[PDB]
Structure formats: structure tokens, C-alpha cells
Ligand SMILES: *[C@@H]1O[C@H](CO)[C@@H](O[C@@H]2O[C@H](CO)[C@@H](O[C@@H]3O[C@H](CO)[C@@H](O)[C@H](O[C@H]4O[C@H](CO)[C@@H](O)[C@H](O)[C@@H]4O)[C@@H]3O)[C@H](O)[C@H]2NC(C)=O)[C@H](O)[C@H]1NC(C)=O
């Protein structure tokens with residue numbers, strides 16, 4: 001989308017995976033969807049260094065709205081859970097130097113069953129721009145035909161544009177056309193800042209693998225259409241929650257950098273382990289994700305339960321990820337020829353190699369015909385960065 | 396099996412899941428299957444308090460033997476990886492106060508392709524007893540028919556008995572029997588100390604869930620046949636490795652106590668986190684597993700992605716596990732009536748409830764008519780212990 005936004009993948013925090021549609025503030029005041037929850041997160045996004053690492057969008061997913069529209073056709077923030085309304089919440093977020101994201105749906109209802117934006121796109125767009133919303137996640141639930149889906153997403157895109165406010169526009173569009181309708185990604189890119197490609201993520205390794213394999217399998221279709229202003233969205237980071245082992249967490253962070261994915265954490269920032277904080281705030285990895293060239297990586301090869309993914313970076317550099325898919329045994333040795341990496345330009349005549357994950361370590365110079373050995377944990381990933389020695393010497 | 400062994404589930408360490416069939420001592424000296432590996436583990440089992448916690452079987456899985464039997468048709472310890480042979484290794488293990496486990500296969504070949512024990516049961520049984528072996532894991536690979544499977548397992552059972560040495564006998568029998576017909580568990584418990592119900596296991600939550608669900612599904616056939624001297628084997632503990640989140644590890648430890656399962660760790664004892672050590676060595680949970688009454692627990696109910704498992708313990712005590720199977724969101728609240736627990740005997744007129752996992756915490760006294768609330772993590776488990784207040788007032 002040509003609105004000058006998301007020139008690098010959007011980063012931030014989205015409540016859904018971690019907190020869901022919890023409406024019981026009586027029994028569960030600390031994890032129900034309320035203005036208090038988002039204020040706490042906003043405070044912490046600053047004080048814990050999340051903003052400094054780059055995460056600046058505090059995003060409300062589903063279940064923020066009251067059951068009915070008001071007498072002027074507007075969506076209403078739930079009276080009990082958001083008594084001070086969205087506007088004040090937006091103001092609070094802006095004062096912390098952050099931006100605010102909200103959620104709506106292209107159909108008659110949101111996925112959780114609350115009011116949809118069908119036949120209200122213009123009204124709803126204006127309401128968001130007025131409050132000071134900076135990002136809209138637009139979901140594809142309860143849409144009766146593919147035609148309405150298309151028009152709806154297109155309509156909201158232009159409806160937002162007319163308001164004159166900069167709003168990052170996030171579309172579940174292509175996800176709702178699977179598998180028997182090929183989405184037009186040229187078309188989707190024209191109207192969206194990023195787009196959800198596949199099924200909802202959850203707190204599991206099964207989900208991550210499912211997402212990775214879908215991406216890699218369909219890579220020819222989706223990789224090249226991504227770039228500054230328009231990204232593929234493999235969904236929220238679930239690092240720091242409950243369902244992933246440490247190695248699986250590392251795999252997500254690494255691969256999301258490779259895929260030039262938006263980085264939306266969905267976790268409890270009040271209760272997050274120091275390791276997780278460190279991984280999610282890793283400077284070097286975030287830098288790979290945020291690489292200004294903005295070219296999405298891809299799976300280079302697979303076999304023997306190993307996977308090699310690579311991504312071209314600005315300054316003729318390269319990120320390379322190696323995944324151990326074998327879910328039995330211990331750290332498994334893997335050896336690749338550096339000549340295979342980066343279409344054979346990366347290490348010609350040579351390249352310097354730094355490991356970024358699971359730990360940072362400078363591995364040194366590897367010439368054009370040399371081999372690299374690593375040991376990768378079951379379900380883990382090794383992430384590397386390759387500087388070409390020709391480029392390196394140039395100032 | 397009526398050999399006076401495994402009166403409580405056997406505990407120890409088995410190399411397979413963690414180290415597999417690694418034969419490259421050249422490139423990987425520290426994780427290839429060697430005598431050196433097992434000596435290191437033996438040293439550590441003592442010095443790190445594993446023996447004290449109860450783990451006393453150091454077990455060799457597949458890929459210990461040479462490719463060929465010697466001229467007298469005996470299995471040979473691989474010349475490079477076990478140059479001092481099994482007998483010396485056994486001696487070393489005994490001097491540390493531990494016991495030694497070995498692996499063989501009922502068919503023509505082991506799962507990894509090494510010599511099988513078919514037509515050598517007597518010879519092989521004698522070889523083991525001579526060496527000082529204390530436990531045999533007997534696998535069901537490369538068996539052409541189900542009759543041979545049965546006879547083979549029966550034969551080795553008696554072949555071991557004839558040697559006169561006490562040997563814990565572990566059978567993959569029913570696991571390899573399942574993809575054809577329903578196993579006779581009365582028959583299996585006659586000849587086996589414990590029995591594997593599954594193909595294998597791995598370092599994954601997927602595997603744990605799969606094991607739990609099959610066990611609960613088939614609990615009518617299998618739970619009641621278990622008891623002192625004969626146990627259901629849901630396979631190795633994978634805690635402390637790579638593929639499980641902390642919560643999933645807790646779930647495995649808790650449920651393996653409920654199921655009166657053997658506790659064979661498969662991990663690298665040289666590189667294990669303090670947390671994993673603490674959980675694997677947890678005194679109270681091990682005590683539940685090792686409860687002398689020796690009754691296997693069962694799934695009490697399931698629904699809404701919650702599961703309740705319970706186990707009767709001696710002294711009219713009860714262990715109760717509650718699993719959150721929902722793999723999305725956060726700590727989900729769950730509430731049960733204490734009258735439902737322990738066939739309604741556990742908390743009548745009341746019970747004292749202690750939480751053992753994920754942390755230890757005294758909850759208090761609960762009347763027969765009261766409800767208990769917990770919050771359980773996605774893929775986690777809460778493990779409780781219930782003492783009845785009639786049994787408590789009987790402090791005299
Ligand atoms: C509503 O839709 C309209 C119609 O597309 C949209 O207008 C477009 O806005 C973009 C982004 O602001 C304009 O692109 C700019 O064009 C100027 C002049 O040629 C350039 O100098 C700008 O360069 C930027 O990008 C560079 C990186 O690529 C940066 O280095 C530099 O610092 C600049 O930031 C930029 O390319 C575009 O011309 C219009 N298009 C048309 C046809 O008018 C408008 O933004 C939308 N409104 C809202 C509120 O969303």
C-alpha cells in the first residue's frame with residue numbers, strides 16, 4: 001500500500017493469542033480485555049525497553065467493542081471494560097510515544113461475534129481516524145461471498161485513505177481464500193500494508209511448523225510480492241508463553257526475521273522471563289528483520305530433516321538460517337558449502353560469518369570453496385550473517 | 396512377572412532417545428555410544444544424587460553390539476566402542492552401587508539392524524547372566540509373525556529364569572502386537588516385569604499427548620492389569636532435553652507418576668539444567684510414582700480441553716492431576732467438586748489438599764461439599780495430593 005507506512009515490517013504488541021476473548025473482569029480482573037490491561041502494557045513497553053528495540057504499536061484485537069452500535073451508527077467501546085473509551089486510551093498511548101492499533105471485521109460480525117463493519121466502512125473509518133487510531137487489523141469472518149470480501153477490503157482501504165490520517169492497514173484478505181481460490185497478490189499489495197496468509201497461530205510447535213511449511217511450499221507465489229510498504233504476515237510471535245520449548249522459540253524469532261515478517265508479540269509483558277525478553281529484543285536479529293532493502297527470504301533447500309533458509313540484505317550481506325527438524329536425539333551436526341549460499345555471490349571470493357542465534361559468536365572468514373560445520377538442536381535454529389569481503393573492504 | 400523384582404516401578408537411565416545410534420566416535424567422541432559414555436553417566440548418577448532420588452538402573456539401548464556374533468554364536472560388544480567389554484562395565488556400575496541394563500531383540504535383527512536373538516535366546520540369556528546384567532530390554536523388531544513374537548518373548552522369559560540371576564525383564568511385546576490384534580495382558584504380565592505399549596517416543600509435546608490419549612482411550616484394557624511386579628511402560632522421560640516447554644515437562648513428570656510408570660530418564664546427565672534436575676528428583680512426586688500400594692491411576696474425565704486423572708495411594712490418600720489441553724491463550728481457570736474425586740471417598744468428610752506441581756503449596760482443608768478452583772497453564776498440569784481427615788485424626 002502506497003501510504004508511506006510500514007517501509008520496514010511493522011512491530012508491536014497484539015493481545016489475541018495471549019488473552020483472547022476474556023470478558024470476565026469479575027473473576028479474572030488481570031487478564032480480561034480492558035482499558036487497564038492496555039495501559040499496563042503501554043507503561044511496560046516503555047519501561048522494559050520494548051519501544052527502544054522497535055516495538056511501538058499497542059494493538060487491540062477482537063472483543064473490545066460493546067454488543068451494539070450507538071444511535072449514530074458508530075461502534076462503541078464496551079462500557080464496563082473501556083469506560084474512558086478508545087480516545088483517551090489512544091491519547092495515553094501517544095503520550096508514551098507509542099501508537100495504537102484497533103480491530104474490526106469486513107463481514108457482518110467479528111470472529112468473536114461482535115458488530116461487523118459491512119455497510120459501515122465509511123462511518124467506521126472516520127471513527128478510527130477521529131480517535132487517533134494508527135493501525136487497523138481488518139478480519140475476514142462472516143463474509144458470505146468472495147466478491148464482498150474483495151470489495152469490503154478495497155472499500156475500507158480507500159475509506160481510511162479519505163480520512164487523511166496515516167493508518168497501517170492489515171488485511172486477513174488472502175487467508176480467507178484458501179485453498180481453492182488463488183489470491184491476486186498484486187491486487188492485495190495495492191490496498192494493504194500487510195496481509196495474513198494462513199491459519200491462526202497458537203502456542204504450539206505444531207502451529208509454527210505448519211506456518212513455515214505452508215510458506216516454503218507456496219514460496220514461489222508470495223515471496224517476491226513482498227517489499228517496503230507491503231508484507232506477508234505469518235501472524236503473532238508466541239515467544240515467552242507456554243507451548244514452545246526454548247529451541248522452538250529461537251526458531252520462530254530467527255525465521256520471522258528471514259521472512260521479513262511483521263513482529264507482533266502476543267504475550268504478558270508483566271510476566272515474561274529474562275531469556276524471552278532478551279531474544280525478543282535481540283538487536284542484531286531485529287536488524288535483519290528490519291533490513292532497509294526489504295526483500296523477503298526463502299527456503300534454499302530441505303532434506304534429511306534439515307532446512308536451509310536465506311535472505312538477501314542491504315550492503316550485499318546475507319542472513320542464513322539452518323533448522324534441525326529431527327525431533328529425536330541431540331545436537332545434530334550439519335555441513336554446507338558456503339558456495340551454495342546467496343546464489344553463489346555471498347562468499348565470493350570470501351565472506352565473514354557471524355552467528356546470531358542461539359548465541360552471538362564471530363566465526364571468521366570462509367573462502368569461496370570452504371565448508372561450514374554447525375551443530376543444531378532438535379527443533380532449534382542457527383542464524384548467521386554473511387558479509388562479503390569485497391564489500392567489507394570498500395570503506 | 397513373579398520374580399520378586401519391580402515391586403514398585405523400575406527407575407533409571409536409558410540412552411536411546413537422547414543419544415540414539417551414534418557410531419561416529421571419530422567426529423563425535425562425546426555422544427557416540429561407548430563404554431566411556433556409560434561410565435560418565437554412572438559417576439554422575441551417584442555424584443548428582445540420582446541414585447539417592449531412586450534412579451539405579453544404567454541402561455544400554457540399541458547399537459552396543461558388534462555387527463557379527465563370535466564363533467560361539469555370542470553377541471559381542473563392539474571392539475572399538477566397548478574395548479573392555481560388558482563384564483568390566485557391569486563391574487564398574489556395581490561398584491558405584493548401581494545396576495546394569497542391556498538391550499536385545501526378539502527377531503532376526505535389532506531395530507537398528509544389529510544381530511537379533513531369534514534362535515539364540517538360551518545362549519543370549521546365559522551371556523547376560525554371566526556378565527552380571529540386571530535388566531534386559533527386549534525389543535520386537537524384525538519378527539515375521541505374531542506366533543514367533545509370542546514364543547520369543549515367552550522363551551527369553553524362561554531362558555532368563557533358568558540362569559538363576561535376578562533380571563528385570565522389559566518387553567516391547569504388546570506394542571508390536573497392537574497393529575494386528577488385541578494383546579492378552581494376563582498372559583503378558585505372567586512373563587514380563589514391564590511392557591512397552593508404543594512404537595517409540597521422541598522429544599516432543601505431540602508425542603506426549605499421543606501417549607496420554609492412547610493410554611486413556613485403552614485404559615479399560617490396561618489399567619487394572621498393572622501392579623507390583625508388572626507395569627505399563629509409556630516409555631522414557633524426555634525432561635531436560637530440547638523439544639518440551641517447561642509446562643510440558645511438568646505434565647510428563649506428573650502423569651508418569653499417575654500412571655505408575657517406570658521412570659527411565661533419557662537425557663545427558665553432564666548437561667542438565669538445575670530446574671530439570673529438581674523436577675526429575677522431586678521427592679514427593681517420585682513417592683507418588685513409587686507408592687507401595689502399586690495401583691495405576693486413570694483418566695477420571697475429559698471435556699472442554701480439560702482432563703482429570705487420579706490415582707489411589709496407600710493410607711487412603713489420592714493423587715489428582717488436571718491437564719489444560721487448550722494450546723492457545725493463558726492460565727485457564729478450572730473448578731471441580733471434591734466429591735467427584737476418589738470415587739467420592741477421598742474428601743468425605745473432608746480432605747487436606749497439597750499442590751505438588753508446578754510448585755509445592757498447601758491449599759488447606761476441603762469439606763465433602765466444597766469446590767476447588769485452580770488455574771492451569773496451556774499444556775501444563777496441576778498435581779495434587781489428598782489426605783482424608785479421618786486418616787489424619789488417627790494421629791495417636
Ligand atoms: C492515499 O492514497 C494516495 C494515493 O496513492 C497516497 O498518495 C501517495 O503517497 C505516497 C507516500 O507519501 C507518495 O509517495 C511519495 O512521493 C514523493 C514525491 O515523488 C517522494 O519524495 C516520497 O519519497 C519517500 O519515500 C522514500 C523511500 O522510498 C524516502 O527516502 C523519502 O524520505 C520519502 O519519504 C514518496 O515516494 C505518492 O506520490 C502518493 N501517490 C499519488 C499518486 O499521489 C496517500 O499517501 C494516501 N493518503 C493516506 C493518508 O494514506
Ligand SMILES: *[C@@H]1O[C@H](CO)[C@@H](O[C@@H]2O[C@H](CO)[C@@H](O[C@@H]3O[C@H](CO)[C@@H](O)[C@H](O[C@H]4O[C@H](CO)[C@@H](O)[C@H](O)[C@@H]4O)[C@@H]3O)[C@H](O)[C@H]2NC(C)=O)[C@H](O)[C@H]1NC(C)=O
Pocket residue numbers: 397398399402555556558559560561562
Ligand atoms: C523363576 O520363576 C519362579 C517361578 O515363577 C520364581 O519363583 C517365585 O519367586 C517369588 C519371589 O522370590 C516367590 O514369591 C515369594 O514367596 C515367598 C514364600 O512363599 C513369600 O513370602 C513372598 O510373599 C511376599 O513377601 C515378600 C516381602 O519380603 C515380597 O517379596 C513378595 O512380593 C510378597 O509380598 C513371595 O510371594 C514365589 O514363591 C516363587 N514362585 C514359585 C511358584 O516358586 C523365581 O523367583 C524365578 N527365578 C528367578 C531367578 O527369577
Ligand SMILES: *[C@@H]1O[C@H](CO)[C@@H](O[C@@H]2O[C@H](CO)[C@@H](O)[C@H](O)[C@H]2NC(C)=O)[C@H](O)[C@H]1NC(C)=O
Pocket residue numbers: 184185186187
Ligand atoms: C491481478 O490484479 C492486478 C491489479 O489489478 C492486475 O494488474 C492490472 O491488470 C489490469 C487488467 O485487468 C490493467 O488494467 C492494469 O493496468 C494492471 N495494473 C498493474 C499495476 O499491473 C493483474 O493483471 C492481475 N493478475 C492476474 C493474474 O489476474
Ligand SMILES: *[C@@H]1O[C@H](CO)[C@@H](O)[C@H](O)[C@H]1NC(C)=O
Pocket residue numbers: 106107108118142143144145148149
Ligand atoms: C450481511 O447480511 C445481509 C442481510 O442478511 C446480507 O444481505 C449481506 O450480503 C451480508 N453481507 C456480507 C458481506 O456477508
Ligand SMILES: *[C@@H]1O[C@H](CO)[C@@H](O)[C@H](O)[C@H]1NC(C)=O
Pocket residue numbers: 501502503513537538539540543
Ligand atoms: C529369520 O529368518 C529366517 C529365514 O528368512 C526365517 O525363516 C525366520 O522365520 C526369521 N525369524 C523371524 C522371527 O522373523
Ligand SMILES: *[C@@H]1O[C@H](CO)[C@@H](O)[C@H](O)[C@H]1NC(C)=O
Pocket residue numbers: 579580581582
Ligand atoms: C489369555 O490367555 C491365557 C492363556 O494364555 C488365559 O489363561 C486367559 O484366560 C486369557 N485372558 C484373556 C483376558 O483373554
